[PDB]
Short mmCIF file of C-alpha atoms in Angstrom, two decimals:
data_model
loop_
_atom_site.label_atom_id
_atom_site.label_comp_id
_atom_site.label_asym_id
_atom_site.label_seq_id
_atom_site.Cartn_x
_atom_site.Cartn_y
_atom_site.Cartn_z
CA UNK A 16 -182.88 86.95 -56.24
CA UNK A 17 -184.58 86.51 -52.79
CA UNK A 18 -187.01 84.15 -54.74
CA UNK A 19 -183.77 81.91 -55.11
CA UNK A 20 -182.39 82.14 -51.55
CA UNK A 21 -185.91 81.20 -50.35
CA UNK A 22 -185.67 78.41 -52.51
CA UNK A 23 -181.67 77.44 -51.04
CA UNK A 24 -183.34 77.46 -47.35
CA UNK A 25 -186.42 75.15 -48.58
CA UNK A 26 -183.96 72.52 -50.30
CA UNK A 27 -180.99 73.00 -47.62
CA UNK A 28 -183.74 71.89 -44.89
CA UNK A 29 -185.00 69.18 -47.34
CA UNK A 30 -181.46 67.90 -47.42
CA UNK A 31 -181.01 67.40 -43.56
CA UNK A 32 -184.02 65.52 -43.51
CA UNK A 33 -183.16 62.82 -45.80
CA UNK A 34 -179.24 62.83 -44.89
CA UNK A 35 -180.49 62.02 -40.99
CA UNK A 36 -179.98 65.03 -39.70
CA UNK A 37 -183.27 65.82 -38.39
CA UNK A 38 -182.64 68.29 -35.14
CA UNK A 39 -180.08 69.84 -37.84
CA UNK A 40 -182.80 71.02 -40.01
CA UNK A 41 -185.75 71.59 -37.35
CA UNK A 42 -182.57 74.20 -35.65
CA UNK A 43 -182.00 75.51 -39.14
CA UNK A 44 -185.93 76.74 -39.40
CA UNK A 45 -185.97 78.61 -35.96
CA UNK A 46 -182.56 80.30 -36.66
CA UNK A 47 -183.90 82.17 -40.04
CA UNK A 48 -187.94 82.43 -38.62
CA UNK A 49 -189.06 80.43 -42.14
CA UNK A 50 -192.97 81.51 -42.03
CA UNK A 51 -193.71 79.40 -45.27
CA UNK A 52 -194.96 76.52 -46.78
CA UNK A 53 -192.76 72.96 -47.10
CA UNK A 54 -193.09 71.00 -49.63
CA UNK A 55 -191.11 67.61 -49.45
CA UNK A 56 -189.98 64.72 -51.89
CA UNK A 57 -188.06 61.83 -52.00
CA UNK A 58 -185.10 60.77 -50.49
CA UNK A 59 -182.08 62.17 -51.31
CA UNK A 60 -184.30 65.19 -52.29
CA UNK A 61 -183.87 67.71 -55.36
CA UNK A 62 -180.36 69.29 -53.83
CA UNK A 63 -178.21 66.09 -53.98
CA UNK A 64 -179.64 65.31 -57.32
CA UNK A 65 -178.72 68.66 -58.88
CA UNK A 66 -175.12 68.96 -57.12
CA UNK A 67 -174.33 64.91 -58.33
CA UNK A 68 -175.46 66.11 -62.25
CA UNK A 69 -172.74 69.25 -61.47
CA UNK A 70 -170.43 66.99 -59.49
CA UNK A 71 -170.03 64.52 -62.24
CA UNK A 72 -169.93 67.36 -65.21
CA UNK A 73 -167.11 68.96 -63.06
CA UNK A 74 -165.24 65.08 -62.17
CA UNK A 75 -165.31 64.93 -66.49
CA UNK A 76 -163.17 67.68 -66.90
CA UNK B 17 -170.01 59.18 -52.58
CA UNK B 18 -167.01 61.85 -52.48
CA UNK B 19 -169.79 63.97 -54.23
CA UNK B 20 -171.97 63.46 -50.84
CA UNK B 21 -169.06 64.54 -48.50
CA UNK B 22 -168.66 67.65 -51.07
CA UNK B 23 -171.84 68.48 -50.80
CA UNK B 24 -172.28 68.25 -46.42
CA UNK B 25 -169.10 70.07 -46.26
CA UNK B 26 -170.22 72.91 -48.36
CA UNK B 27 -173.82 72.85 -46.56
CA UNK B 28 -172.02 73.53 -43.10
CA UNK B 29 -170.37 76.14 -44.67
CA UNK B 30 -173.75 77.59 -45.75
CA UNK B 31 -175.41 77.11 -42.17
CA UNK B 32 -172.62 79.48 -40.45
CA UNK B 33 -172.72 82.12 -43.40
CA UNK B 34 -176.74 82.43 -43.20
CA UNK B 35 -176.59 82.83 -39.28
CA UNK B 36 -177.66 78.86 -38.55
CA UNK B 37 -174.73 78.77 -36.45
CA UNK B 38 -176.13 75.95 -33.86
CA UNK B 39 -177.90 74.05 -37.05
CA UNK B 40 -174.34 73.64 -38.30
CA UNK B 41 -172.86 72.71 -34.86
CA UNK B 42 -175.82 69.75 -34.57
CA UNK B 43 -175.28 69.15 -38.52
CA UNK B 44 -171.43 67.84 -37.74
CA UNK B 45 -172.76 65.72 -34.72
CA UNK B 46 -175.55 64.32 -36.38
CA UNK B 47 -173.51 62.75 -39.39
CA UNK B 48 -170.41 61.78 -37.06
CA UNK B 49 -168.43 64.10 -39.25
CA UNK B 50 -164.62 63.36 -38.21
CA UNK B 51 -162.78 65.36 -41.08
CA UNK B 52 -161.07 68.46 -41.10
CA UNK B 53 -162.86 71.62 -42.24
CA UNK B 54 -161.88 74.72 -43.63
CA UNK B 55 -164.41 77.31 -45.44
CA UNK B 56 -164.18 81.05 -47.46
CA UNK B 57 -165.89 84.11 -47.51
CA UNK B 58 -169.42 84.65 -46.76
CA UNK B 59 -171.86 83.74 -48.63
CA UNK B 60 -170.18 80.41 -49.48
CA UNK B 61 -169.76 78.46 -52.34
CA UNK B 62 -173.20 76.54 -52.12
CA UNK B 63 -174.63 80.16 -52.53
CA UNK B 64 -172.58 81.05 -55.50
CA UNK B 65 -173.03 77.48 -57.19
CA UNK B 66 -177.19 77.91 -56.80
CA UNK B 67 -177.72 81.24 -57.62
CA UNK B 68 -176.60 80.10 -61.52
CA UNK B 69 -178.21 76.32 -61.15
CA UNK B 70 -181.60 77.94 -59.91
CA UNK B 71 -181.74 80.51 -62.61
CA UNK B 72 -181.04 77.52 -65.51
CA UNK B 73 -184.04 75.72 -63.82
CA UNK B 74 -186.60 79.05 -62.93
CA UNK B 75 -189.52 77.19 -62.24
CA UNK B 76 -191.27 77.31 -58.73
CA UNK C 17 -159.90 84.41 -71.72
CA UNK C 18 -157.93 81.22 -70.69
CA UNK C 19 -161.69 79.70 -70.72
CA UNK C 20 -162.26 81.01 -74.39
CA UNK C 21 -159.26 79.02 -75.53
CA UNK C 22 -160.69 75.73 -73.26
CA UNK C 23 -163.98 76.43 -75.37
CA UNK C 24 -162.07 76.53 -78.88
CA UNK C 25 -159.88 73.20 -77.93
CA UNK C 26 -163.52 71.55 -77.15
CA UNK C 27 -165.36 72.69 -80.39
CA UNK C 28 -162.32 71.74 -82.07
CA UNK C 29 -162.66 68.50 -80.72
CA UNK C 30 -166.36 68.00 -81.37
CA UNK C 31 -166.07 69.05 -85.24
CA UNK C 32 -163.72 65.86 -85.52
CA UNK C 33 -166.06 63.41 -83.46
CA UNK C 34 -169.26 64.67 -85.62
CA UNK C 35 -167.47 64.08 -89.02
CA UNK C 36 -166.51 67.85 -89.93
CA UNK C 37 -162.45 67.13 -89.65
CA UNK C 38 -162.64 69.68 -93.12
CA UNK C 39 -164.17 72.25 -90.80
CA UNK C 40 -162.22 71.27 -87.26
CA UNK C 41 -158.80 71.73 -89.84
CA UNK C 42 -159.49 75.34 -91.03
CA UNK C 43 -160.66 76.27 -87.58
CA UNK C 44 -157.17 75.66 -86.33
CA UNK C 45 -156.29 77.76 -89.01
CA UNK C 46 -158.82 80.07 -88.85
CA UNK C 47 -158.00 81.08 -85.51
CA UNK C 48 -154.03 81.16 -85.91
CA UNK C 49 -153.81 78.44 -83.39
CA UNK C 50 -150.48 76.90 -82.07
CA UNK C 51 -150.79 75.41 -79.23
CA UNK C 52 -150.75 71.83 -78.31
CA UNK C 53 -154.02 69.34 -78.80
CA UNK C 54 -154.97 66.22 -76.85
CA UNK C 55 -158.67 65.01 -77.24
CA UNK C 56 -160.33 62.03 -75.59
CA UNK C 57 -163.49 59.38 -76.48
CA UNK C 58 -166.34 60.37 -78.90
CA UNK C 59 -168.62 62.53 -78.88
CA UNK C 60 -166.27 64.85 -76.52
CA UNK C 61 -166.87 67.07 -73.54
CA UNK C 62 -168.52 69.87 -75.14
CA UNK C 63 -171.34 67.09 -76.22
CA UNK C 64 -171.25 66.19 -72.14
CA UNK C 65 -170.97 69.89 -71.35
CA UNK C 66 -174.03 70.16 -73.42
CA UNK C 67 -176.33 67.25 -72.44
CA UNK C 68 -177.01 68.43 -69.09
CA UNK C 69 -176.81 72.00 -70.02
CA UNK C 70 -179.45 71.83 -72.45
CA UNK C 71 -181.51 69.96 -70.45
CA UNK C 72 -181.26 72.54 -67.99
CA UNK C 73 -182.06 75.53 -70.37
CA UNK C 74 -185.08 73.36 -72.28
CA UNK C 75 -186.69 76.38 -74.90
CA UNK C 76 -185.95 75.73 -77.86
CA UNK D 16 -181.67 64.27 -77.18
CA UNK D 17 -181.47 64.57 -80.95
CA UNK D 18 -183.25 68.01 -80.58
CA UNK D 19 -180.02 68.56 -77.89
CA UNK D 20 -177.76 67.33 -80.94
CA UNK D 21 -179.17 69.85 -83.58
CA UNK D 22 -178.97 73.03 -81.13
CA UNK D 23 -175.75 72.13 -80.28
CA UNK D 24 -174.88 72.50 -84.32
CA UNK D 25 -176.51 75.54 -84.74
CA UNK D 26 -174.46 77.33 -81.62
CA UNK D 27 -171.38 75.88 -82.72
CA UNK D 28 -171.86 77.20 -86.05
CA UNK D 29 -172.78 81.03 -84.92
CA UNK D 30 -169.33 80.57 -82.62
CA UNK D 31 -167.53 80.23 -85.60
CA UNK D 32 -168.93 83.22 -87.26
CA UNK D 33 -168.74 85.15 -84.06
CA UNK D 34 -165.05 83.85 -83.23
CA UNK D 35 -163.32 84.84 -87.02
CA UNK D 36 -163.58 81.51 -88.43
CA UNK D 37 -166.39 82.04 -91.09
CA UNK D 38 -164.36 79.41 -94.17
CA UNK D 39 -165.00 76.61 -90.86
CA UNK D 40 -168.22 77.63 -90.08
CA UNK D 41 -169.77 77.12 -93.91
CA UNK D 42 -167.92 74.09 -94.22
CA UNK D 43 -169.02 72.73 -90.89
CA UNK D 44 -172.75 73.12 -92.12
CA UNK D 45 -171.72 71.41 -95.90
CA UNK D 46 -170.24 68.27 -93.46
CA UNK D 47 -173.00 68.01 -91.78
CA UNK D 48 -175.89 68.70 -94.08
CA UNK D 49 -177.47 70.79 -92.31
CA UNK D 50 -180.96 71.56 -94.20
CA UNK D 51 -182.74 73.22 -91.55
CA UNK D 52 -183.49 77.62 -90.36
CA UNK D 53 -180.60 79.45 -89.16
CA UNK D 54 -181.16 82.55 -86.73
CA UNK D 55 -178.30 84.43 -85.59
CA UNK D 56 -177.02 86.54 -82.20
CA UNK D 57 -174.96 88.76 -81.38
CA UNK D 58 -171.49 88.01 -80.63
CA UNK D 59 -169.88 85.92 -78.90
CA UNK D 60 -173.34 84.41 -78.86
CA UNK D 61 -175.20 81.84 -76.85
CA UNK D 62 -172.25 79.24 -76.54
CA UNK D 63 -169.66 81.54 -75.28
CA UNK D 64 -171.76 83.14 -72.96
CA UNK D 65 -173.26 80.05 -71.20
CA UNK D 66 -169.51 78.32 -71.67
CA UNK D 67 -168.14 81.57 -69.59
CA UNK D 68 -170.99 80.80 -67.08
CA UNK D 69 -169.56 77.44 -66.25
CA UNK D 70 -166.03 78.48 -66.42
CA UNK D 71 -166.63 81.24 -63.93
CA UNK D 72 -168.06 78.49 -61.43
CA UNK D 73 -165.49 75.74 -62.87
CA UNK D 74 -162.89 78.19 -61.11
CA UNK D 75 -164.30 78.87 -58.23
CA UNK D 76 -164.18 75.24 -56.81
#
């Protein structure tokens, strides 16, 4: 449960990176006092990815 | 690419419901976001939408 | 309850694209069914529905 | 992918079972030829449930 909104933070931040939004996400880590590791990847980064595979399931129906 | 604008509407939305009230004020700026926006109840639908993706995927 | 009878219409769908119209007819039956049908393409939504469900779940 | 296809099968078949429509459900697995281990849940089983799952977040968009 908190595991997951941990997780939300981590990928939300990841996401302002790559969209060019980068005093977005540097804001976004002060405002909720994240003490933990980041761990990036590649452009557009795993939150776009998932929401497109749910975006184009939910565009089929 | 209507998926993207989706997806940066519903993050906004996020930002305000955890408390990353400025974060979502530069967000808008930052991607020259000129649409109209309207939102629900806290927590938000990116909350509601993860909390079932991330328990398909577990992992780490 | 209006999503059980979305999930019959779908299975009922995928019996005739995997070649069990036998099966997808009694079903119909089965279930006292009477309401309309439309269908789309092979192999169906529930096999799209599916796809990126399962690869979500993995196990086995 | 054809390990996908086969579950697929086997979850559709326990729905039928589960959902009162056991004459479809044996015929189904004739149709198909199905020659392979069959291991049952509890109803509505596995395909409901995770179809309710979607639903649930189909209708809240």
């Amino acid at each position: 449960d908190a595991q997951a909104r941990e997780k939300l933070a981590l990928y939300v931040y990841e996401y302002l990176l790559h969209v060019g939004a980068q005093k977005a996400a540097q804001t976004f880590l002060s405002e909720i006092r994240w003490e933990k590791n980041i761990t990036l990847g590649e452009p557009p980064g795993f939150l776009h990815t998932w929401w497109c595979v749910f975006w184009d399931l939910y565009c089929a129906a």
